[PDB]
Amino acid sequence: GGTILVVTGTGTGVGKTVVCAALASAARQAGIDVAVCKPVQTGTARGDDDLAEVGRLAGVTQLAGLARYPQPMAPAAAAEHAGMALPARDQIVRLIADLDRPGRLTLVEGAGGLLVELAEPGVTLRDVAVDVAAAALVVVTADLGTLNHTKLTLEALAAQQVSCAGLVIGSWPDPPGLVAASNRSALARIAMVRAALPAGAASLDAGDFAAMSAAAFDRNWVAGLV
Amino acid sequence: GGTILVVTGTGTGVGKTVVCAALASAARQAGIDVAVCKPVQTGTARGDDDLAEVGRLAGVTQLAGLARYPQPMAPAAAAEHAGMALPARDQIVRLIADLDRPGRLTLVEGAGGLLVELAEPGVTLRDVAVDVAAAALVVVTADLGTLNHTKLTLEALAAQQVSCAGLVIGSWPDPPGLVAASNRSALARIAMVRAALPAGAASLDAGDFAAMSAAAFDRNWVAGLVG
Numbered sequence: 001g002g003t004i005l006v007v008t009g010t011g012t013g014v015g016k017t018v019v020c021a022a023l024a025s026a027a028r029q030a031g032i033d034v035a036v037c038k039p040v041q042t043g044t045a046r047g048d049d050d051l052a053e054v055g056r057l058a059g060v061t062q063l064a065g066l067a068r069y070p071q072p073m074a075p076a077a078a079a080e081h082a083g084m085a086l087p088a089r090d091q092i093v094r095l096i097a098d099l100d101r102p103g104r105l106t107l108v109e110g111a112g113g114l115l116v117e118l119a120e121p122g123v124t125l126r127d128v129a130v131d132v133a134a135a136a137l138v139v140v141t142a143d144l145g146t147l148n149h150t151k152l153t154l155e156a157l158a159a160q161q162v163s164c165a166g167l168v169i170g171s172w173p174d175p176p177g178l179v180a181a182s183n184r185s186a187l188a189r190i191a192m193v194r195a196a197l198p199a200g201a202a203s204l205d206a207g208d209f210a211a212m213s214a215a216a217f218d219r220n221w222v223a224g225l226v
Numbered sequence: 227g228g229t230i231l232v233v234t235g236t237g238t239g240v241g242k243t244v245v246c247a248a249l250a251s252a253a254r255q256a257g258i259d260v261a262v263c264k265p266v267q268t269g270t271a272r273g274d275d276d277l278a279e280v281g282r283l284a285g286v287t288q289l290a291g292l293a294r295y296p297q298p299m300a301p302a303a304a305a306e307h308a309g310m311a312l313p314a315r316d317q318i319v320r321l322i323a324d325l326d327r328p329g330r331l332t333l334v335e336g337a338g339g340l341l342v343e344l345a346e347p348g349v350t351l352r353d354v355a356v357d358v359a360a361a362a363l364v365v366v367t368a369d370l371g372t373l374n375h376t377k378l379t380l381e382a383l384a385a386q387q388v389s390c391a392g393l394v395i396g397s398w399p400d401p402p403g404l405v406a407a408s409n410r411s412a413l414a415r416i417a418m419v420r421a422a423l424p425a426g427a428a429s430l431d432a433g434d435f436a437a438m439s440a441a442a443f444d445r446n447w448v449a450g451l452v453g
């Protein structure tokens with residue numbers, strides 16, 4: 001196989017997708033083949049489609065998904081309101097593992113955060129990450145509260161021996177501001193900060209987003225990913 | 227001693243103070259002597275003073291602070307930015323043990339979320355709860371994000387055998403939308419939900435707030451907090 005990263009966030013709206021896109025883009029630009037798997041998508045009622053954002057921003061075509069729920073809520077809650085179970089632990093793991101292939105970076109995007117139920121029964125992105133032996137790249141914010149949320153997340157990760165491939169700040173504010181500037185220093189004392197995506201990065205066109213992405217991550221880290 | 231409860235949250239701005247005040251108020255009305263403790267207060271240059279708020283809302287006069295930093299930031303950053311050091315682990319613990327007393331509910335309101343550093347090095351409210359043998363009451367929101375945040379907090383508490391006293395939804399909308407309602411249902415499956423304070427509970431005057439506080443909590447749970 002190749003390298004499987006699960007991409008998780010410290011919450012929702014923290015920039016998970018724009019981060020998958022950005023690393024997919026950067027790794028594509030290093031001649032790495034990228035697949036992005038979003039097993040469970042929610043909020044399709046209002047048009048959430050993270051795989052499509054990825055395809056648009058990053059030109060990834062191996063965009064793989066299992067289920068889509070309309071309600072913009074947690075996967076189990078959306079599934080509840082819709083009357084249909086979540087996927088199985090088995091389809092998630094096998095879907096990801098079949099994606100995996102040597103020379104390919106396979107990015108697995110969760111829904112919300114690390115412990116929200118993704119499959120039946122009660123199985124989380126952390127379990128998935130375990131099952132496929134993937135590290136977790138953690139998307140974090142720059143705002144007040146990120147340090148707790150990040151400490152909590154890395155703790156949860158360590159608890160099941162899921163390695164941490166670092167943090168990405170989903171949205172770097174401009175101007176940074178006292179808190180954000182502080183948090184970036186503080187966050188790097190906890191884990192490697194692979195990039196800080198500028199605020200507004202999700203609105204860029206493909207060509208701009210590609211430039212952004214290549215400039216966002218350390219080139220060697222990216223190339224050293226597979 | 228009596229009963230010590232650290233009050234944490236899944237984050238910041240989730241309603242730790244209002245809950246502190248609300249549980250204080252419900253406890254006082256049950257005839258329980260309440261002290262509220264805020265070992266680390268940041269944002270004092272903003273006017274942030276949670277003890278003052280808890281005093282204002284619940285009429286608690288047994289308020290006990292230790293460290294105050296002016297900038298509204300994490301204690302560590304607030305401390306560093308002001309040229310100050312964080313308290314030591316035992317300074318916080320000493321403040322709490324000095325309030326602890328039989329028949330008293332001592333509430334220790336954290337700063338931000340459970341794993342915020344309160345004292346050098348990396349000492350958190352979780353560690354403080356081990357030191358004073360306090361259970362933790364987790365203040366959560368009803369909003370998108372919360373089930374992951376609550377599970378992270380509870381897992382983090384269980385990692386140090388810090389028992390969970392339950393959850394309080396710090397702001398509960400009326401009416402509740404699909405998300406809020408579904409979040410409440412799932413929250414109650416994770417732990418006991420001891421109250422859901424109505425949104426804008428902080429704008430209630432003293433006797434409105436005390437009325438809200440008495441209804442918000444199960445009298446039996448409150449009464450059983452202190453012997």
Ligand SMILES: O=C(O)Cc1ccc(C(=O)[C@@H]2CCC[C@H]2CC(=O)O)cc1
Nearest residue numbers: 043072073074111112370371372373374
């Ligand atoms: O942990 C919790 O209870 C909260 C929670 C968990 C997952 C999600 C979602 O999947 C969101 C639904 C609308 C956008 C989408 C964004 C995303 O996937 O992060 C939202 C909230």
Ligand SMILES: O=C(O)Cc1ccc(C(=O)[C@@H]2CCC[C@H]2CC(=O)O)cc1
Nearest residue numbers: 144145146147148238298299300337338
């Ligand atoms: O980012 C992290 O996790 C660390 C962090 C630590 C403390 C705080 C605070 O204390 C807030 C700062 C201004 C109000 C105040 C409200 C509160 O007491 O939580 C916020 C974040």
